[PDB]
Amino acid sequence: DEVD
Amino acid sequence: DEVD
Amino acid sequence: SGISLDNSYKMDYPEMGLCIIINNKNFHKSTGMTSRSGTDVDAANLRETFRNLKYEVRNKNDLTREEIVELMRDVSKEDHSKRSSFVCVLLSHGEEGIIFGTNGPVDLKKITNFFRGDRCRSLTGKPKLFIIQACRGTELDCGIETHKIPVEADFLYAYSTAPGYYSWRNSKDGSWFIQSLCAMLKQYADKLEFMHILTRVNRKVATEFESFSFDATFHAKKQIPCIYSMLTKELYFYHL
Amino acid sequence: SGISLDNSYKMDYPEMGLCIIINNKNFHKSTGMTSRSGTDVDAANLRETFRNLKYEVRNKNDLTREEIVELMRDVSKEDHSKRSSFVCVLLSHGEEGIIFGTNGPVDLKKITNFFRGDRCRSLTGKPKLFIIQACRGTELDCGIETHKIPVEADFLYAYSTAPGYYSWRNSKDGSWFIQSLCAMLKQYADKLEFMHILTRVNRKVATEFESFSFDATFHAKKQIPCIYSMLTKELYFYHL
Ligand code: NA
Ligand code: NA
What we know:
The complex is a heterotetramer, with 2 copies of chain A and 2 copies of chain C. Chain A is 0% helix and 50% strand. Chain A has one strand at residues 2-3. Chain A contains no helices and 1 strand. Chain C is of the alpha/beta class. Chain C has a single domain (1-240), classed as Rossmann fold, CATH 3.40.50.1460. Helices cover 25% and strands 24% of the residues of chain C. Chain C has a 6-stranded mixed beta sheet with strand order 2-1-3-7-10-13, with helices on one face. In chain C, helix 4 packs across helix 5. Chains in contact: A-D, B-C, C-D. At the C-D interface, strand 8, strand 9, helix 5 and strand 13 of C face strand 8, strand 9, helix 5 and strand 13 of D. The complex binds sodium ion (2 copies). One sodium ion binds next to strand 11 and helix 4 of chain D. Chains C, D: It is found in: Cytoplasm. Chains C, D: Keywords: Acetylation, Apoptosis, Cytoplasm, Hydrolase, Phosphoprotein, Protease, S-nitrosylation, Thiol protease, Ubl conjugation, Zymogen.
């Protein structure tokens, strides 16, 4: 999981 | 007619 | 029992819920804000419309910014366990993100934060509807000829106008948006899902209204409302 | 003929319309923006999903801010007379109101302005859908346990996340929002009106996803998408  |  | 579906909010709690209407007509002279002629027509129409949907309506008039915040805080601290939903209608001056108390502005985010899923537990999982008749800026539309859940889930913001734009209010008839909203709720609340009612409101405002002004800057202008949905289920005001 | 109703957009033009997918994965080193692992999964899923809805899909990868603006301008100047609708999907970094080209930001308002009712006449009265997978700020949702028409009319913005919030992308599976959107379109596009499909997307993202991180600041976080509708009619991807 990564944030944009 | 009037604006808020 | 037989097969079941869970695509719609449970609206058969003992109570539909509160409908808080904040009707700001007269503003403190030092703010320089004009009186909002026609807003009492809106507030009366809303009271009757939501009464017939079986909401517990509370009308409040000419609240300061401090009174708006304290009212919303107090309401968010009530026990809503037996209520299906919550409705708040704001009638006032505004700008993007802001509605005006009689003596100064209130952040809309501050108002709605009180009802976050983690801060109002008896409304968690229930639809929280904010209906806003207020300007969002000063643009004019010239028209064209033709498990956990998120704390921000289950909110709906029904804005009278597009972001950045003025919103129009007729001093005799009430605001374009509230007039149209009540008309569509009266006609379709026993028939249509709420997003589809609001889409008919969008069409009514967009097609049936156009401003008339002796001032060319303000004449022949149009308006489109904005539905801002973080709902997770369909919303019907009736139940089986 | 018999009685007629006009509550839904006409979607039986010869063509459904264009679906422009802008897929920005790799950014110029001087911007300091990270590569968006998983976005190719999103772009492929979208291409297949909108292909099966009979859209003319155009995939574009790693566009500069200048290329994004020129692409949108050029597309808005095509003749859309035989097309029912227009779809644009933006996959990139972002902040509130902004999506990033590979070398810097683009205002979302500039992109969408090209398609205003007065500026793209062959799309006037037709639905213009903008689907945005991009951050809108840096907030994290901790969750809780459980006649004329307006020039801004007929736009729909399907945002992956609430205003002010990060948006989540899985490097293996794609973004939470695009994964969910394609799944719900595949299952319901022949069945449900588009607002109701998007409400199921809201529920899927809100209930089925939660972040996992070794960093406590970013761990166990939730997301709710936002439907921003200025549509004036119901939208069905099928016709009779
Ligand atoms: Na209005
Ligand atoms: Na996402």
